[PDB]
């Protein structure tokens, strides 16, 4: 888990004890590193940082990503029951019960009033043969409209309206666990801003070149 | 009025055409099955993907590196997904297919793995195993080998 199964964690120098008389230079930091006088810390790749730190193989996983369970000990690594000749369906259910049957393929279709109203209120009433109550429907719809706010602000940010960075801070403030994963939130705003202006300057220069190449054949 | 008889007769030939076509499809797919299981037994499919050879094993990180680049596409499955072997092509121009049994698919990658499997999988061959004839053969053959030794 500490590499999130990837096997490549970021090595970072937290604090370096500089000799009295030098400057914080990357070469002197490396000189302290080769003598191990700098704090080598491992950070998971889950934390998406704007600067790609040096990614080295995870010391825990040995590059595998799979760890044997230390609770399962060598003395208690063995059973005596005749399970292999007598595998019952409950082992099949046991390996079944951790894959969750993805609801996301319909949940990402539920960002619509009609589809979510059909799935959320009416279809269970039809199949089961019952009816909801008024407060039940109201609480369902209220919690659902509370849930839809994140992708509402996500769609507002994605249009890149002027001053979307404030809406982007709103996005990172409303719900963090989903905010740490989406590619729609750029980590460094000046990076993408001046990369957009640089790509614009690049495309006009490209069209000027593609237009000036047409006046040498006549 | 007789144009309706024309219409119903062409409807009959259309329905029978669909029936014959699905018959031909099923005939073709069991024909391919029999062709595979016949041509494998003469050593002609040896070295190919369906009958590959053993090589060095593969760890978990290498396995998702293979899967993320859509490289591994022919796979063999055993024992509730505790053992998965990947079959890959190697340049020998002759191109030979090799087997690598991947090491310790830990517990629970499947919710993501089958999310990424279905995009690159073209053909699965799961080697589901029987248990009782296997044990009968194992004990009888053990008696046979030790009786022949003695």
């Amino acid at each position: 888990t500490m590499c999130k199964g990837t096997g490549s964690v970021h090595y970072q120098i937290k604090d370096y004890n500089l000799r009295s008389g030098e400057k914080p230079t990357a070469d002197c930091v490396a000189d302290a590193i080769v003598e191990n006088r700098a704090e080598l810390v491992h950070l998971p790749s889950s934390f998406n940082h704007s600067a790609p730190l040096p990614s080295k193989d995870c010391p825990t996983c040995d590059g595998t990503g799979a760890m044997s369970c230390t609770e399962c000990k060598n003395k208690l690594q063995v059973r005596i029951s005749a399970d292999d000749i007598m595998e019952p369906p409950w082992k099949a259910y046991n390996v079944l019960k951790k894959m969750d049957y993805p609801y996301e393929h319909i949940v990402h279709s539920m960002k619509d009033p009609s589809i979510a109203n059909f799935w959320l209120i009416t279809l269970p009433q039809i199949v089961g043969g019952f009816d909801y109550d008024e407060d039940v429907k109201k609480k369902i719809w209220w919690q659902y409209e509370e849930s839809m706010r994140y992708d509402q602000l996500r769609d507002l940010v994605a249009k890149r309206n002027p001053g979307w960075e404030y809406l982007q801070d709103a996005l990172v403030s409303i719900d963090p666990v989903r905010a740490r994963e989406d590619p729609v939130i750029v980590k460094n705003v000046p990076y993408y801003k001046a990369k957009k202006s640089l790509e614009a300057e690049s495309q006009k220069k490209a069209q000027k070149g593609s237009r000036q190449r047409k006046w040498w054949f006549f | 009025k007789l144009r309706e008889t024309e219409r119903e007769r062409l409807s009959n030939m259309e329905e029978l055409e669909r029936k014959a076509n699905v018959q031909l499809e099923r005939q073709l797919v069991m024909a391919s099955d029999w062709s595979r299981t016949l041509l494998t037994m003469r050593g002609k499919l040896k070295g190919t993907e369906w009958d590959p050879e053993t090589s060095h094993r593969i760890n978990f990180s290498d396995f998702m590196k293979l899967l993320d680049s859509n490289s591994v596409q022919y796979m063999e499955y055993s024992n509730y997904g505790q053992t998965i072997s990947v079959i890959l092509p190697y340049y020998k121009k002759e191109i030979i297919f090799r087997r690598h049994i991947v090491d310790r698919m830990p517990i629970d990658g499947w919710n993501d793995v089958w999310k990424k499997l279905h995009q690159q999988i073209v053909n699965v061959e799961v080697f589901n195993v029987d248990v009782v004839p296997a044990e009968v053969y194992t004990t009888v053959a053990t008696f046979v080998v030790w009786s022949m030794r003695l």
Binding site: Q77, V78, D84 | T83, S85, I101, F127, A134
Partner: peptide
């Protein structure tokens, strides 16, 4: 099928042979 590695490890395997 099920191999018994010493120190008591039962390893599941592919089909056989």
């Amino acid at each position: 099928l099920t191999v018994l590695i010493k120190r008591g490890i039962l390893i599941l395997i592919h089909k056989k042979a």
